[PDB]
């Protein structure tokens, strides 16, 4: 049983130009992309992304950082949402794990370089406000025997 | 002191095709290659190797997976044989630590990539299993003095 | 607010010409360099460095060591000293976590590649004692306004 979750690389990720590298440690899993794109991330949208922290002090702050470049990203895997969090490791560089994305890239929670779901609901919902149903390709990974039991 | 330990990349390490990345992790901390051999795991072999699992309901599937191509290697260092198994990380992919070959590569149990031993008998008698002796290499690493205290 | 501090890569590190994967480590989270020198250890300079085991069985052996080839650095970020000794690791890399310097490339304390201060005192200290002041270069990252928040 596979599930997907949605990964977004923040600007810095774009900016400071590790794309590759973190497409990289989810492929290397085995974890299967099942949806990419690039696109400018706006306020409207953001405030959506957002919607749970509307009206808190840091949000207008945050909308700024994320006002720019994002890759949009669904990859799909064995318990994949948790995964993922795992390996992106604590929102707060300085309290991440070594090996994780976050303490292996970034010093301050406010650019700590890419976004996933925290959970199946936000994932659904996520998935929807960021992507097209077009946009979610269905296809099988030729490895699938020596990656799943 | 050091010991010797017995690693063996699985199938799905073969057919994934990371055996490099797997032997230059353990190359990276100076542990020194002393045996290493392809072959291809067959059922009655396996069933010595996994010995301890004897009468265990899940002994054929176990078997049935191991069953293809393998590398046996003999590496050597200081507590070598704790030490690969921390870098292997936690039987299921899902809780090894980040960093850990298991958690860097891989997603569930019955594909999780290396087997290595478990303890100074194990790696006795594993090593004994795969390898006779003359296929067991000593030499001494150049790098040796700005290795070990 | 960022802070400076002094990181050392040993004989060890040299000898194994690793340098360029430490540094690239450090450069990976946007952390600056802000003072790089290679040099040749003194047993006068060692004292000091080591000035708090002064009368320690143990210390004429780790001047020893640490007299030959060394890579004196100064990197600036937030949080830095604490987080470069966590990247670092345990001073003992059998116990250090994976992902860590010494987890990732060593086996004993006696060679583990590189020191790192473990104060905001100490940093200050090993600073103005392996470097001049003039020594001390203040630039600023062009990638800046993504890597603090």
Redo the contacts between chains.
Sequence with gaps: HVEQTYLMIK??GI??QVVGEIIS?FE????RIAAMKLTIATPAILEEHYAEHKGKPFLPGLIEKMTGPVLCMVFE???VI??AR??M?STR??EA????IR?????????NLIHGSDSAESAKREISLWFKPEEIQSYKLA?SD????
């Design positions: 600007p810095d900016q400071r440690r290397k899993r085995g974890y895997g064995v318990d948790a995964q795992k390996m490791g560089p300085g794990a070594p090996g994780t303490a292996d890239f970034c010093q301050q929670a406010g650019r490895l020596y990656i799943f039991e």
